[PDB]
Amino acid sequence: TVQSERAFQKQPHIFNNPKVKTSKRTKRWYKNAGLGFKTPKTAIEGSYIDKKCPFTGLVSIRGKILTGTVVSTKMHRTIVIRRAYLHYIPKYNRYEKRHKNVPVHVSPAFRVQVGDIVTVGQCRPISKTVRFNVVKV
Amino acid sequence: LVTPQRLQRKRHQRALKVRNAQAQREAAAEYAQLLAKRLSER
């Protein structure tokens, strides 16, 4: 796709030279916001836009990198992961079944599968409630 | 009122501006000397 909205989607200020000839018309902007990853081929030769993504959008990653299992993908560009971590209680002195909800903005770099494990880090706050961003599934 | 002191202070402001510039743009050149030394080194 190229549009889903009345407005236009475009990488801001990374434009081509609109006089001379190049076979891209927009230099798709490379970035990596850290964490030692190699840049993805979908970002080098991709087609989406995603201003909340950490590979073309202008948001940065650092801080709290955590993991979990994907259970919910039904929203728009944001998936909910399951940090299924066991807790401890001073009453029982045993272990118990616990998990919390963590939503994370999915990126269309690689596909959005229901069930995989992701490695997501703390970003500048993309929305009202979601705080992290997908850097790698 | 124009005093002997007021144009003295105006003269001192002139002297301070010209002295600050005549130190700054020369310290630029003494930095460029070390940069030229390292450029001949590498």
């Binding site: 434009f15 609109p18 018309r25 | -």
Partner: protein, 140 residues
């Protein structure tokens, strides 16, 4: 939040606004002129705003023609015409060239008048031209 601004066209009149932590912001109202820029070889000029044709979120602004960010324009073409025929020696892209004797150009606003108080246009050229003519076809 604070009050809306909804700045219009003609008769430049700007509120003086001090905000949180210095940062003097220019709440411009009723913008009359605009600095625009050739996006492929870089010449800018103050240029007289005529009207706003497109709004990318609400056709209330296509009705009332309120100046904001990201609203496609048709503005003046005459100072770009005078430079285009006064320094060239030619006195003339092809679909940009088609917008010469129509008396109107096409561009877009990025600077917020309720925040910065400026008025910026970049002359769209290429796939911007193609998508925005398709948006003119989407309206019409």
């Amino acid at each position: 939040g604070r009050q809306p601004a909804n700045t219009k066209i003609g008769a430049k009149r700007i509120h003086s606004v001090r905000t949180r932590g210095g940062n003097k912001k220019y709440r411009a109202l009723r913008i009359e002129t605009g600095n625009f820029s050739w996006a492929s070889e870089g010449i800018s000029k103050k240029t007289r705003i005529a009207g706003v044709v497109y709004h990318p979120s609400n056709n209330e602004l296509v009705r009332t023609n309120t100046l904001t960010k990201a609203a496609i324009v048709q503005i003046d073409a005459t100072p770009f015409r005078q430079w285009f025929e006064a320094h060239y020696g030619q006195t003339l892209e092809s679909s940009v060239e088609s917008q010469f004797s129509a008396g109107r150009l096409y561009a877009c606003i990025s600077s917020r008048p309720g925040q910065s108080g400026r008025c910026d246009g970049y002359i769209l050229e290429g796939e911007e031209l193609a998508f925005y003519l398709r948006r003119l076809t989407a309206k019409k």
